[PDB]
Design a protein around this nucleic acid. Structure first.
Lengths: 223, 207, 118, 104, 71, 83, 129
RNA sequence: GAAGAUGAUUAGAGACCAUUGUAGUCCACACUGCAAACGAUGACACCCAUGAAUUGGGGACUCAGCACGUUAUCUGACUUCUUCACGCGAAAGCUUUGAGGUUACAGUCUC
């Protein structure tokens, strides 16, 4: 792109070789405020960007009416990183460009476990999870190997992104409003790490934030 | 702490100051979450804060600002005149950043703004009306330390120092004690002497 | 009637950077405005001139909404350096402190105990 | 349908009474429950200030001699009644929830 | 709601048997008034003798004439 | 620690942090889950350097249970004195 | 009244766990409630517990380490069997890996895992994650 | 005061309004059981946080070892936070006083 100037601590570190992966940023909870943080760390040839929806919205005005376009982006790596944008712009290309920014901010990692057969690398979600936006709520159920992605084409996409290849699913409520279904499905795949399991606990040690360690070089950064 | 020689413990003259300038008291109203801090109630109806409790809170917050090796990342904030003065004198010594007068929204979250900053830590004079600050500390992963009136809520306050924020002489004492002890642990002013400059410098005066 | 924010902005900046302008006379302040400024309107220059007068006339009271560099001096007008003074007086040299009986009870059960003059 | 008012425009709480006596209006003669009805207290003068002077002149045992009495009454109004003489008015959401208790 | 007891069975059964009569997708199967009503007897097709050709109108949003047959 | 294979090899992207107070997994999603680092002190007021660490969850600043838990954590490690 | 002792106990535990509280009180006590707790304390989900004696009915008190996520009760005590372990373990639990259903048997009170091992089914009791 | 009568109002008007007036409005003994009979929230039971009050009981000469009030505590009722915590809900809203503890779906019964 055009030449870039970080206004973020993280941004500086990422432009240097200090933070070299998403993991570091995630592990000590910090918000991503610049999409350029994603592009630098995760190289292109792993990232994919699809537009799940583009639709007109209308706002009422006396006589003629102004119009706009909502759209969704979806983004991520098949290595277990996903992130869903949605944004609004008064023209087509506007809302498109805007979506992809927001999407790369909202990126979250994915835990994949097993069904109770352990071979290779994860093919299955570690547990049942649910996510809800509007009246729709999705129930992701873990499936045995070779099941394939058993869901509708709308979530099939969203699951392919997140590296889940074996699942069984069902939805509830009004599912024929597209937008609500997307957000729902995504909140599901978050909830994995949000749930405490015996395998994880051992009172795993914490250490200093990248920010703190690199404080000196951020001071120098400011200059 | 330990191992240690009873270091950074309350003393004769320390107590003598606090009682005198009336920061040992709280606000009159009963707490909404700070019930534990209160020690009894007077026959004036004003809730006294326990001294030992307050003291340990202060030492704690010293350990926090001691653990920032680039003090400018810590912020101080007042929205009250009585703390205004004491901020400026503190930001000289300890070297902290500050905003005083009034908090401005989006100094910790809005990218397009030249008053933008990303703190490591945040302080406040009153969590009640500095509240905008706290709610933008929440979403940036910034811990908080506040000077809590007994009445005051503790929402989005991680660590809390019970305090009286009514009148000049109350608030000045607290900043003075922090600043003192902080500089005793960094740049090693000894606790052998009484500290170099006075609490009268931290009193609001009007110009 | 009411003046625009262009006027008030420019005039505030002027009164900060210059104390050559100090007058309540329209005429003097006009001639020093116009030569120092490029604004290319008679209206704006006359406005700005009259605003600078209005500033100074209000400063005779004290409070203004204007901007001056006078703040420099007003800040170091604060001299709070006195030899103890309020510090050790409050701690009581023999000046005395008296306080509630609940406060007393708290103190004497502390590890420190009561300090003198309480 | 929608619960516009929690107390339903009443000073009657749920699950207590479910019946409070009707009371006439001093305007139109309409009946409504006492709790719904809109109370005010008047304190109506028996003389204007302008006339008070003139009468207190001719008085010796009254006016100056004793302070003038006033007609006191309670006025219970209907809803419609109140609104039309604009002594109760519509308010925004934040304000509608406010009460001033029984004090003026 | 429902009853979770061990011997609760008969109440459940009788509840269903009542509430299926509020379904029209039950009636349409089990009830023979529906069968009777249908002009084929519920058969796939039937034959008839043409009586008269009857021109039939159409509803308001789409104005047309439609060709129909009284059989 | 973490998910393993039958070959014993870790499959996880990361192992999330512990909130010591509730022993619950701090998510990346929670940005109110702050890591408070206090610097220890020895005799003669010399800082040992930052050694100890606390981690607080973002579910403890939605009702301000934060302060309470920090005390029980601290007091147990002898950092905060009680009489 | 209460028609299941278990239901009264394990709705105090679940609620308390969702609030992160580190101890809970339990109003009644039974021989049964004991055994249930015992299981989970072995597998590491509970610190300790005390039974206190009022000499009418006891009051259990438990120390939560926050390692639980739910403790349920399967109220009708439906019959599960050697094949039908599979069925339950899928349907009511989020996993087969760390889902624990607890059952009653003539033998005693035990996990499904141990039930299969000794090859006796029985009537179900409760479950936890 | 339904019905009725008369006068207005109106293009038309027992209309809404005004003056009247029967049944009825009251009581006793019989029927009727038809209401927005509403909290549009079935009943019993458990868990669940913030603040300030009110209503009863309890606790620390002559209807009189009394009565009231204040501080603090408790049990039982009605409700407010117009700073009600978690959570739930499509939203409005609901919050120990549930529509909360529910797709992680099972306390009990019934309509």
């Amino acid at each position: 792109k055009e030449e870039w100037v970080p206004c973020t601590k993280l941004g500086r570190l990422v432009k240097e070789q200090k933070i070299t992966s998403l993991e570091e940023i995630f592990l000590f909870s910090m918000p991503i405020k610049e999409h350029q943080i994603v592009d630098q760390l995760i190289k292109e040839s792993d990232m994919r960007d699809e537009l799940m929806l583009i639709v007109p919205v209308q706002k009422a005005t006396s006589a003629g009416q102004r119009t706009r376009f909502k759209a969704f982006n979806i983004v991520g790596d098949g290595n277990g990183h996903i992130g869903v944008g949605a944004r609004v712009g008064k023209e087509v290309s506007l809302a498109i460009r805007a979506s992809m920014i927001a999407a790369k901010l909202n990126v979250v990692p994915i835990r994949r476990g097993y069904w109770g057969n352990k071979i290779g690398e994860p093919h299955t979600i570690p547990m049942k999870v649910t996510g809800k936006c509007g009246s729709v709520s999705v129930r992701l159920i873990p499936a045995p190997r070779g099941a394939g992605i058993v869901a509708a084409p709308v979530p099939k996409k969203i699951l392919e992104f997140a590296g889940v290849e074996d699942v069984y699913t069902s939805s509830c409520g009004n599912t024929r409003t597209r937008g609500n279904f997307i957000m729902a499905t995504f909140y599901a795949l978050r909830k994995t790490y949000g749930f405490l399991t015996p395998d994880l606990w051992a009172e795993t040690e914490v250490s200093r934030d990248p920010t703190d360690e690199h404080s000196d070089f951020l001071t120098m950064g400011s200059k | 702490v330990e191992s240690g020689a009873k270091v950074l413990r309350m003393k004769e003259g320390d107590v003598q100051k606090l009682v005198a300038m009336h920061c040992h008291l709280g606000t009159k109203n009963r707490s909404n979450a700070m019930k534990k801090y209160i020690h009894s109630r007077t026959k004036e109806g004003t809730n006294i804060i326990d001294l030992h409790m307050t003291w340990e809170k202060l030492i704690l917050a010293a350990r926090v600002i001691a653990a920032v090796e680039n003090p400018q990342d810590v912020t101080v904030c007042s929205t009250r005149l009585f703390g205004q003065r004491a901020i400026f004198k503190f930001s000289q010594l300890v070297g902290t950043s500050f905003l005083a007068g009034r908090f401005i929204p989006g100094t910790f979250t809005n990218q397009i703004q030249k008053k933008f900053m990303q703190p490591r830590v945040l302080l406040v004079t009153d969590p009640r009306t500095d509240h905008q600050a706290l709610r933008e500390a929440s979403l940036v992963n910034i811990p908080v330390i506040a000077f809590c009136d007994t009445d005051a809520p503790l929402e989005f306050v991680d660590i809390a120092i019970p305090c009286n924020n009514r009148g000049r002489y109350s608030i000045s004492m607290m900043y003075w004690l922090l600043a003192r002890e902080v500089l005793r642990l960094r740049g090693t002013i000894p606790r052998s002497v009484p500290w170099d400059v006075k609490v009268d410098l931290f009193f609001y005066r009007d110009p | 009637k009411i003046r625009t924010k262009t006027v008030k902005r420019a005039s505030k900046q002027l009164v900060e950077k210059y104390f050559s302008k100090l007058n309540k006379d329209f005429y003097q302040n006009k001639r020093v405005v116009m030569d120092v400024t490029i604004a290319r309107s008679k209206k704006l220059k006359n406005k700005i001139a009259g605003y600078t007068t209005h500033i100074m006339k209000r400063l005779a009271r004290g409070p203004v909404r204007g901007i001056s560099l006078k703040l420099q001096e007003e800040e170091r007008e604060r001299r709070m350096d006195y030899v103890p003074e309020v510090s050790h007086v409050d701690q009581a040299i023999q000046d005395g402190v008296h306080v509630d009986k609940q406060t007393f009870s708290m103190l004497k059960r502390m590890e420190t105990g009561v300090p003198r003059h309480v | 349908m929608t619960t516009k008012r929690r107390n339903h425009g009443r000073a009657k709480p749920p699950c207590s009474r479910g019946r409070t006596r009707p009371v006439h209006c001093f305007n139109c003669g309409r009946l409504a429950p006492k709790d719904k009805a809109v109370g005010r207290f008047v304190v109506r003068r028996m003389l204007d200030q302008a006339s008070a002077r003139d009468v207190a002149e001719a008085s010796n045992v009254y006016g100056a001699g004793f302070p003038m009495p006033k007609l006191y009454m309670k006025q219970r109004f209907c809803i419609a009644c109140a609104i039309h003489s604009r002594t109760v008015r519509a308010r925004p959401t934040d304000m509608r929830k406010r009460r001033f208790t029984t004090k003026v | 709601t429902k009853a979770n007891g061990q011997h609760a069975a008969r109440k459940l059964v009788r509840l269903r048997r009542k509430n299926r009569w509020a379904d029209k997708g039950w009636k349409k199967s089990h009830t023979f008034v529906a069968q009777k009503a249908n002009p084929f007897g519920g058969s796939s097709h039937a034959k008839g003798i043409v009586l008269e050709k009857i021109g039939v109108g159409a509803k308001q949003p789409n104005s047309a004439i439609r060709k129909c047959v009284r059989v | 620690i973490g998910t393993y294979n039958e070959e014993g090899v870790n499959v996880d992207l990361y192992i999330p942090r512990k909130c010591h107070a509730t022993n619950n997994l701090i998510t990346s999603y929670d940005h109110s889950a702050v890591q408070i680092a206090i610097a220890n002190v020895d005799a003669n007021g010399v800082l040992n350097g930052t050694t100890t660490t606390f981690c607080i969850a973002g579910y403890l600043r939605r009702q301000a249970e934060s302060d309470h838990a920090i005390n029980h954590l601290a007091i147990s490690k002898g950092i905060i004195r009680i009489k | 009244t209460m028609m299941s002792v278990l239901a009264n106990a394990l709705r105090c535990i679940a609620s308390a766990e969702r609030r992160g509280k580190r101890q809970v009180l339990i109003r009644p006590s039974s021989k049964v409630v004991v055994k249930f707790l015992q299981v989970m304390q072995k597998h590491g989900y509970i610190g300790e517990f005390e039974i206190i004696d009022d000499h009418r009915a006891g009051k259990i008190v438990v120390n939560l380490n926050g390692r639980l996520n739910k403790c349920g009760a399967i109220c009708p005590r439906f019959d599960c069997t050697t094949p039908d372990f599979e069925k339950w373990v899928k349907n009511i639990l989020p996993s087969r890996q760390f889902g624990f259903v607890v059952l009653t048997t003539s033998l005693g009170i035990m996990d499904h895992e141990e039930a299969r091992a000794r090859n006796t089914g029985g009537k179900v009791l409760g479950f936890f994650y």
